Amino acid sequence: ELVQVLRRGLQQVSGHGGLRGYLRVLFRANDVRVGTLVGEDKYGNKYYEDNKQFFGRHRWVIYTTEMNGRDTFWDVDGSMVPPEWHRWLHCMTDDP
Amino acid sequence: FGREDRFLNYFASMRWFGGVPLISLGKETVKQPVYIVDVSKGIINAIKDPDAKGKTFAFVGPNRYLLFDLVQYIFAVAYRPFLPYPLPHFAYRWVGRLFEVSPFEPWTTRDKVERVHMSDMTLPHLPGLEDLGIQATPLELKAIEVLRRHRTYRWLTSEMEDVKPAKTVNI
Amino acid sequence: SRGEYVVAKLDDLVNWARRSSLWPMTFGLACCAVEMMHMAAPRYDMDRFGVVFRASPRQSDVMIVAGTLTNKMAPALRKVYDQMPEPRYVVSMGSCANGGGYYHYSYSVVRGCDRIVPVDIYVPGCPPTAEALLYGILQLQRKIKREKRLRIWYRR
Amino acid sequence: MWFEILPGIAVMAACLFIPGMATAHIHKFTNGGKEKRVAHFSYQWNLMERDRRISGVNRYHVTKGLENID
Amino acid sequence: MNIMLTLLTNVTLASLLVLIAFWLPQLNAYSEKTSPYECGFDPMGSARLPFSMKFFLVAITFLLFDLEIALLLPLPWASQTNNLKTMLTMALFLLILLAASLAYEWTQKGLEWAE
Amino acid sequence: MFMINILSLIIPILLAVAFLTLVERKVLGYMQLRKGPNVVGPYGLLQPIADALKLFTKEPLRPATSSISMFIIAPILALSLALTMWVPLPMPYPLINMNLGVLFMLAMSSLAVYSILWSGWASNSKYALIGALRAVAQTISYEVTLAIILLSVLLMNGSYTLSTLITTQEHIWMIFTSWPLAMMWFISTLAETNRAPFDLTEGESELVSGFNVEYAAGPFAMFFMAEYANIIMMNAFTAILFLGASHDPHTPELYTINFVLKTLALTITFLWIRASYPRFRYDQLMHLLWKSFLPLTLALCMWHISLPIMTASIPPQS
Amino acid sequence: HPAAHGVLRLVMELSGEMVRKCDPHIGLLHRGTEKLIEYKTYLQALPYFDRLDYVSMMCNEQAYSLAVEKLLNIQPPPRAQWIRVLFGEITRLLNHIMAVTTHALDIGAMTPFFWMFEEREKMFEFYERVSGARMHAAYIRPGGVHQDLPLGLLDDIYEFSKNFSFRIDELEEMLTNNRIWRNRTVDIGVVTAEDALNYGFSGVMLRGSGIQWDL
Amino acid sequence: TYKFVNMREPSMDMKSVTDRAAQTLLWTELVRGLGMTLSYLFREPATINYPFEKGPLSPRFRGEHALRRYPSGEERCIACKLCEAVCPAQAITIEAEPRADGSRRTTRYDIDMTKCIYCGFCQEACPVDAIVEGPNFEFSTETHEELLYNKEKLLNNGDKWEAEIAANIQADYLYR
Ligand SMILES: CCCCCCCCCCCCCCCCC[C@@H](O)O[C@H](CO[C@H](O)CCCCCCCCCCCCCCC)COP(=O)(O)OCC[N+](C)(C)C
Ligand SMILES: CCCCCCCCCCCCCCCCC[C@@H](O)O[C@H](CO[C@H](O)CCCCCCCCCCCCCCC)COP(=O)(O)OCC[N+](C)(C)C
Ligand SMILES: CCCCCCCC/C=C\CCCCCCCC(=O)O[C@H](COC(=O)CCCCCCC/C=C/CCCCCCCC)COP(=O)(O)OCCN
Ligand SMILES: COC1=C(OC)C(=O)C(CC=C(C)C)=C(C)C1=O
Ligand SMILES: COC1=C(OC)C(=O)C(CC=C(C)C)=C(C)C1=O
Ligand code: SF4
Ligand code: SF4
Ligand code: SF4
């Protein structure tokens, strides 16, 4: 079953668009999990869910690299989420 | 002179070299230092004084000291061994030029050495602290608050009235 | 210029080192310290950011005022802030520390810890949630990232 | 995860590998490639000193075989 | 010679680390920063006042028991003598006397700390 | 060439200590249902660098009441001794080959206590003094029993040379012959290194920071590195003493890998024990070492003096 | 101090490390709450009791509400009383977790704190779902409770309750039979029943001495 | 009804005495504690990946304050001053007068967020759902003065967070 988890890791590498995207998501979010895309903002934030994860890790957001005027490739904060995706991301509701 | 000054701390820090170099042994220099709080209060009073529009003030201390006596008192308040030796003007200038090379804040400069050895001017025709309602604080009342940091553990608790104030060349 | 580039790179390196290793003093006052503990709890795991509690003031970089500051305690708080080697930072957390809060009009409460020590970040709440305090700490990290010490020294 | 603790353990293991291997290779490099001699007692030291004297190059690890006895 | 060089290298590295730590960063020392730490309030007395030791008798017994270590250390070489009977008898005599001294200290309330 | 050897010994040891800090933090976190440093660098691999850089760019303090000479001397002695206690270790070849290596480690380890003693005294504060007195009590508690255990274990090696321990355990580990001595030795090495459950000299919940409460920045980092280097060195010594790897003269890399794996296992066991237990009272440590460890150690020393003579198994090299 | 448990100035007179005298100095967190209460209305003074004992908050709310109800000669409805007792037991769980884990942490056991504070976090989630505040709820009021339970709260409380016992068992396996823990705790701080009664003790500090009392 | 916690007596037979001696000399319970820590080492951690993952909240969550409008854009607040009267911390300051068209509207509406205890009493007291405590909790500032809100800031917060505030109220107004 070790081969199974290693193959899962290889597929995690492949599901982020190659080594470059895998390393980008590893160095930006410190996480390489692959989820189902729920939607995208008009600012560029992407939203993913994976219901097999325990409560708290089953929803997440990959932040945009460029908000109104600042470069947010490295400097991201939780206040960049618009109110509707704020409601969805904090589990105040079930409907995106 | 004060807690963050470059006057009392400057002389107190000369203990690291072992001796105190003074031009002409400091017997031909007279100083009149002033307290920092007195200067700040004078500034505030000059702001609040309507008669001080175009005036020019001179803020000086109450006592005049010889440089030798002042440094000896400084080392006595800090309870450090005083080893004063005379250093010629050109040698002191060379030392200052050597110290000027620091890319950071210099320990001393040629200009600083020039200003330390130069006697304070007497300008009795100018207004002073007293004309703004300020009674200048003597050095003997505030020296400990600056020089207690420079003591060792053995002398840290000594009170201010233990170090026998120095001689003043006044009038 | 070469020197400008070198000082910019060195400033970036020192800023990254300072903000990637933040050690708050083991110091709490009231209810907000419970949320500080919950930020140290497994769910948020402040240690995963490099944030480690240390008891001694001489081994601390950040001071988090978490609780009401009274008049009886102000000398001790100022004393332990003074015994912090520099560079040091202060985070005011909760209404009581920010401006007095529920006890603003009391006879024995300091109306804000910024009357005693300078504050870098104000975290609002009564108490702020563990996520709110974490957001405040990350904001402090972003503030440290923006310091220009060596560039300003070179520009002198 | 618990397997993310492994990169740091691997780095520490690599760091701890260096002293022993470096000592072995430095001993090999400065002793003709044959495992630096041990002298716990005076007899072994006398053996090394005789080796040094008969080597002809002031180096003990230079070994003379049966080709040196004509 | 090699050990002397090793000690010199280690001491030099430690001293250079101290010198770097003290001359690299910015120093801002004032009276309140350099005061002793007593959890936010000034200490009442001095740290140089006598500090009573409740285990002094055990310390003297440690002085006495440390020399039996020097007596017992050459045993690996002593095991190579021809007369193993005398060597074993005297080693067991020394260890039995040490255990007897420990028992005497234990039974007369010597290992209890002073109150 | 010998200076290159000294550097190749001491620099990797410092790097290993730096990353052992991270490994300990992550192991404790995962044992506490959290992660540990995961953000700065991938899997926290740049956390030690940030810690060192932050510590060495911070202001060091000289207390007003402190005796400055001893205050500065103590961390230098601590780190120097911590680095020095590595040179006689056979891995499988030592930097310095000594006839009496074990006695050398004993003497230098008993010298290393004065770093804590003098730092606590020169700090001229009450908590540091309490830490120094606790260190005195700890040394009195453990020293004699540690020495007797070492003698008992080495009665089967035949000498005090550390390399001979590789030959003694060529076929069987020494732990299968002296496992009670091994247990008491492991506890004694936990007590010697001031490690949980025997970290009284610092005693965070009791004495704030203890003997090093007045130290800051680089001088404090020096004590930290000395402590962690002592941890690694003592676990390596235990691995050599009780879990002997097989040495092939034509491939010492196998022995190096084996020994490093064993000492890493022992260090991880140290972190495990820290994460698993509460702390002792420093009088209870003395009572444990003098009323339980000492009589058994004396009886086992008698047993290990007798056993080779009865069994006709006396080791060589008189 | 890490073990001062907040803001306490314990002036200790010691011979060596033997404690000759203890002098507790308090008031470093005296906020003058009672005067401020005198300056508020009965509903305005309710959140002060949340902040009196910030580890058991709904219990303080319950005590204040019971006093005000006694003075008002009114009676809460049965559902309010059942909710009050349920959340009081949850609050007791929170308080006991914090107390035991921090006691162990002060003695030297750091890990059960981390184990049990996740359960504390889930109970905080219950608090927030019922009131909107994780710890300072102001939920219990002199008329009953502010709001009714959301439609899916009892199921989640049941899910937490059916599993909390295993966490308790793990904590006990960590501490109960450990010989170091017993050495640090057995025969320490012994108080007699008569002394405990005369000194005004209550709760566990009585029950540990054999006094059979529970309000 | 009471029970005893520490009132057991051990057996004195050879078997149990030897088991206790083995426990004392071979450290059984310490090994059991080590085993429990080892078991915890191999479990999945409960940490979440903030700020990319967020902690669960509810429609009742009391965060940052905001002022609301009617669907036409007219403000809901009519300066009744009930929120100011009920505020336990005296954090709300209000001044009002007739508007140019004769409406009852405020000219000053401030909340001192360093005085506020975030109890939500103001939104209970409001009869027109004009003042609310929103879902936002990440609004830490760098200066004290930035936490002294006036009417413009609160109206901006309402316009900024209305899309979420209205949905949160729709899911909870039936409990109020
Ligand atoms: C030789 C011994 C003495 C010197 C020792 C030096 C040790 C080596 C130096 C280590 C370098 C590594 C540090 C850089 C890592 C930063 C990674 C990256 O993330 O940084 C970004 C940008 O980095 C900084 O802008 C610059 C960092 C480095 C600047 C230049 C490097 C200078 C090195 C020169 C070494 C010479 C030393 C002097 C010798 C005397 C900002 O991202 P960050 O905010 O973190 O993370 C946000 C959190 N998220 C991801 C979850 C959203
Ligand atoms: C880890 C193992 C490997 C490391 C090996 C390298 C070891 C390096 C040595 C350790 C010290 C490193 C610290 C570097 C900073 C320099 C500190 C000092 O030396 O510089 C100034 C020295 O300059 C002095 O001010 C006077 C300048 C000249 C002194 C006269 C002596 C005669 C020298 C001749 C100069 C003429 C030209 C020289 C070229 C020929 C002192 O300034 P100061 O403010 O106190 O200290 C604070 C430093 N700050 C500002 C960075 C915070
Ligand atoms: C034919 C016969 C030949 C010889 C036969 C010899 C067989 C003898 C069998 C018994 C020997 C066992 C040796 C055990 C030595 C100490 C055991 C002991 O009893 O000590 C305990 C205490 O010892 C401890 O509990 C240790 C305390 C510190 C524990 C720290 C963490 C534990 C470490 C985890 C496991 C470590 C594994 C050790 C080996 C590692 C590999 C080297 C006494 O304390 P109390 O319970 O208070 O009783 C005294 C009061 N009446
Ligand atoms: C394990 O490291 C920690 C501490 O050091 C022992 C603490 O003191 C604290 C604070 C809690 C005590 C009771 C002061 C926390 C939260 C912590 O995580
Ligand atoms: C609940 O009781 C309290 C403690 O015990 C756990 C504390 O440690 C502290 C403060 C110490 C840590 C760092 C939070 C406070 C303020 C407190 O109220
Ligand atoms: S702000 Fe609120 S939670 Fe924080 S200490 Fe003050 S009253 Fe307690
Ligand atoms: S939440 Fe409470 S304290 Fe804050 S403004 Fe509203 S009524 Fe006042
Ligand atoms: S209670 Fe509502 S309507 Fe009345 S003044 Fe306050 S915000 Fe306006």
CSV table of C-alpha atoms in Angstrom, one decimal, chain C residues 5-119:
chain,number,residue,atom,x,y,z
C,5,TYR,CA,21.6,46.8,-4.2
C,6,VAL,CA,23.8,45.3,-1.4
C,7,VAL,CA,22.0,47.2,1.3
C,8,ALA,CA,18.6,46.3,-0.2
C,9,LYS,CA,19.4,42.6,-0.3
C,10,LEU,CA,20.9,42.7,3.3
C,11,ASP,CA,17.8,44.5,4.6
C,12,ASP,CA,15.6,41.9,2.9
C,13,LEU,CA,17.6,39.1,4.5
C,14,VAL,CA,17.5,40.7,8.0
C,15,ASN,CA,13.8,41.4,7.7
C,16,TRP,CA,13.0,37.9,6.7
C,17,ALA,CA,15.1,36.5,9.6
C,18,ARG,CA,13.4,38.8,12.1
C,19,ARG,CA,9.8,38.1,10.9
C,20,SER,CA,10.3,34.4,10.4
C,21,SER,CA,11.4,33.9,14.1
C,22,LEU,CA,9.1,35.8,16.4
C,23,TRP,CA,9.3,34.9,20.1
C,24,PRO,CA,6.5,36.4,22.2
C,25,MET,CA,7.0,36.6,25.9
C,26,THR,CA,5.1,34.2,28.1
C,27,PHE,CA,2.9,37.0,29.5
C,28,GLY,CA,-0.9,37.3,29.9
C,29,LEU,CA,-3.3,39.3,32.0
C,30,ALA,CA,-6.9,38.3,31.5
C,31,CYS,CA,-9.5,36.6,29.3
C,32,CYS,CA,-7.6,37.4,26.0
C,33,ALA,CA,-4.8,35.1,27.2
C,34,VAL,CA,-7.2,32.2,26.8
C,35,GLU,CA,-7.6,33.0,23.1
C,36,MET,CA,-3.8,33.3,23.0
C,37,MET,CA,-3.6,29.8,24.4
C,38,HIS,CA,-6.1,28.6,21.7
C,39,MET,CA,-3.9,30.2,19.1
C,40,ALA,CA,-1.1,28.1,20.5
C,41,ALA,CA,-3.5,25.1,20.4
C,42,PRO,CA,-3.2,22.4,17.7
C,43,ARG,CA,-5.9,24.0,15.4
C,44,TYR,CA,-4.0,27.1,14.6
C,45,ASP,CA,-0.5,26.1,15.8
C,46,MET,CA,1.4,29.4,16.0
C,47,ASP,CA,4.6,27.4,16.3
C,48,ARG,CA,4.2,26.4,12.7
C,49,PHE,CA,4.8,30.0,11.8
C,50,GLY,CA,8.0,30.2,13.9
C,51,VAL,CA,6.2,31.8,16.8
C,52,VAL,CA,7.5,30.3,20.1
C,53,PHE,CA,6.7,31.4,23.7
C,54,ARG,CA,9.6,32.1,25.9
C,55,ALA,CA,9.4,33.1,29.6
C,56,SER,CA,12.4,35.3,29.9
C,57,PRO,CA,12.1,38.9,28.8
C,58,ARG,CA,15.7,38.9,27.6
C,59,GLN,CA,14.8,36.1,25.2
C,60,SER,CA,11.7,37.7,23.7
C,61,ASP,CA,11.0,39.7,20.5
C,62,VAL,CA,7.3,40.4,20.8
C,63,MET,CA,5.1,41.4,23.7
C,64,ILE,CA,1.4,40.6,23.5
C,65,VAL,CA,-0.7,42.6,25.9
C,66,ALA,CA,-3.6,40.2,26.4
C,67,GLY,CA,-5.9,41.5,29.2
C,68,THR,CA,-6.7,44.5,31.2
C,69,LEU,CA,-3.8,46.7,32.4
C,70,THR,CA,-4.3,48.1,35.9
C,71,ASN,CA,-2.5,50.8,37.7
C,72,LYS,CA,-0.9,48.3,40.1
C,73,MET,CA,0.5,46.4,37.2
C,74,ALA,CA,1.7,49.2,34.9
C,75,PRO,CA,5.2,49.5,36.6
C,76,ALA,CA,5.8,45.7,36.2
C,77,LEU,CA,4.6,45.7,32.6
C,78,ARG,CA,6.9,48.7,31.8
C,79,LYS,CA,9.8,47.0,33.6
C,80,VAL,CA,9.4,43.8,31.6
C,81,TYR,CA,9.1,45.8,28.4
C,82,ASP,CA,12.3,47.7,29.2
C,83,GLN,CA,14.2,44.5,29.9
C,84,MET,CA,13.5,43.3,26.3
C,85,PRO,CA,16.6,43.6,24.0
C,86,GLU,CA,16.0,45.4,20.8
C,87,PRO,CA,14.5,45.1,18.2
C,88,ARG,CA,11.2,44.6,20.1
C,89,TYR,CA,7.5,44.8,19.2
C,90,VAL,CA,4.3,45.2,21.1
C,91,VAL,CA,0.9,43.8,20.1
C,92,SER,CA,-2.2,45.2,21.9
C,93,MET,CA,-4.9,42.6,21.9
C,94,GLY,CA,-8.5,43.1,23.0
C,95,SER,CA,-10.6,46.1,24.0
C,96,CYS,CA,-9.1,46.3,27.5
C,97,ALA,CA,-5.5,46.7,26.2
C,98,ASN,CA,-6.5,48.9,23.2
C,99,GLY,CA,-8.6,51.5,25.1
C,100,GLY,CA,-9.8,50.2,28.4
C,101,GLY,CA,-12.9,48.5,27.0
C,102,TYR,CA,-15.5,47.4,29.5
C,103,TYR,CA,-13.4,49.0,32.3
C,104,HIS,CA,-12.4,52.3,30.6
C,105,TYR,CA,-14.1,54.5,33.2
C,106,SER,CA,-12.7,52.6,36.3
C,107,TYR,CA,-10.5,54.2,38.9
C,108,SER,CA,-7.8,51.5,38.7
C,109,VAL,CA,-7.5,50.8,34.9
C,110,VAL,CA,-5.0,52.2,32.4
C,111,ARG,CA,-7.0,53.5,29.4
C,112,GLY,CA,-5.0,51.6,26.9
C,113,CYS,CA,-1.5,50.0,27.2
C,114,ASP,CA,-0.2,52.6,24.7
C,115,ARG,CA,-0.1,55.1,27.5
C,116,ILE,CA,2.8,52.9,28.9
C,117,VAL,CA,4.5,51.3,25.9
C,118,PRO,CA,4.4,52.0,22.2
C,119,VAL,CA,2.1,49.6,20.2
